[PDB]
């Protein structure tokens, strides 16, 4: 996260760290959607251009974290993966279309003050909140700059940008399975997700029922926090039917 702030304790209790067993490092962000299911970006697990192809046994999910590096004894819970599920039509070749993956935990995670699942939007929640100008929140332990590493979880609030403005900011082809967010150069305010933030959630707080909904997944960008550029997110509601199918097994 570039131009964000340190998160408050328990501010994002669905925040998940995808952790590589060897070498011991940060792989990606992710989110807790139930006691047994974790949502991430498919590119965190499968990305042939960079020789990325992780199997269940290659990583761990670390839930309830705040500090990036320290083992948070009596706070975080570390879980092993039973099974990975990548969207069958995930497009890593061109534009990261349908950049979504589900991960089943070996054992259910126990909820606490620091561990709690985020809601997934229904059709109406998605229609009422996914509007240009409406702000969402992105969290992660990713790069503080495009070319620093934070001590604690970072947070940034960013407005959803109009589809023509997203389309006009890049040469990459944009689909209905993605949206873009961030400030324009005229707005003054800054902020963006960056490398290491991938797979993390873009959330919004419903003004109707006061619950937090995950509307997006950190997917891609071209650089980080560049003027006239925007961060791209997987549109969660557009792929909810695949999500429901995998969970219903």
């Amino acid at each position: 996260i570039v131009e964000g702030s340190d998160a408050e304790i328990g501010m994002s209790p669905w925040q998940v760290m995808l952790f590589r067993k060897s070498p011991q490092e940060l792989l990606c962000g992710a989110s807790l959607i139930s006691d047994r299911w974790v949502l991430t970006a498919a590119h965190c697990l499968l990305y042939p251009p960079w020789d990325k192809n992780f199997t269940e046994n290659d990583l761990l999910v670390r839930i309830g974290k705040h500090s990036r590096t320290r083992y948070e004894r009596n706070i975080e819970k570390i879980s092993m993966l039973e099974k990975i599920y990548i969207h069958p039509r995930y497009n890593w070749r061109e534009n990261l279309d349908r950049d979504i993956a589900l991960m089943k935990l070996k054992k259910p995670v126990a909820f606490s003050d620091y561990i709690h699942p985020v809601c997934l939007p229904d059709r109406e929640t998605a229609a009422s909140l996914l509007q240009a100008g409406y702000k969402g929140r992105v969290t992660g332990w990713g790069n503080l700059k495009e070319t620093g590493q934070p001590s604690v979880l970072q947070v940034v609030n960013l407005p959803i940008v109009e589809r023509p403005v997203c389309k006009d900011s890049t040469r990459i082809r944009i689909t209905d399975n993605m949206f873009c967010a961030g400030y324009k150069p005229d707005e003054g305010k800054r902020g963006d997700a960056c490398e290491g933030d991938s797979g993390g959630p873009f959330v919004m707080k419903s003004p109707f029922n006061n619950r937090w909904y995950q509307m997006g997944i950190v997917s891609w960008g071209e650089g980080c926090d560049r003027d006239g550029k925007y961060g791209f997110y997987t549109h969660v509601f557009r792929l909810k039917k695949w999500i429901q199918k995998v969970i219903d097994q």
Partner: peptide
């Protein structure tokens, strides 16, 4: 620069 995690998690 990541702190060692308990052996129990493999």
């Amino acid at each position: 620069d990541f702190e060692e995690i308990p052996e129990e998690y493999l």
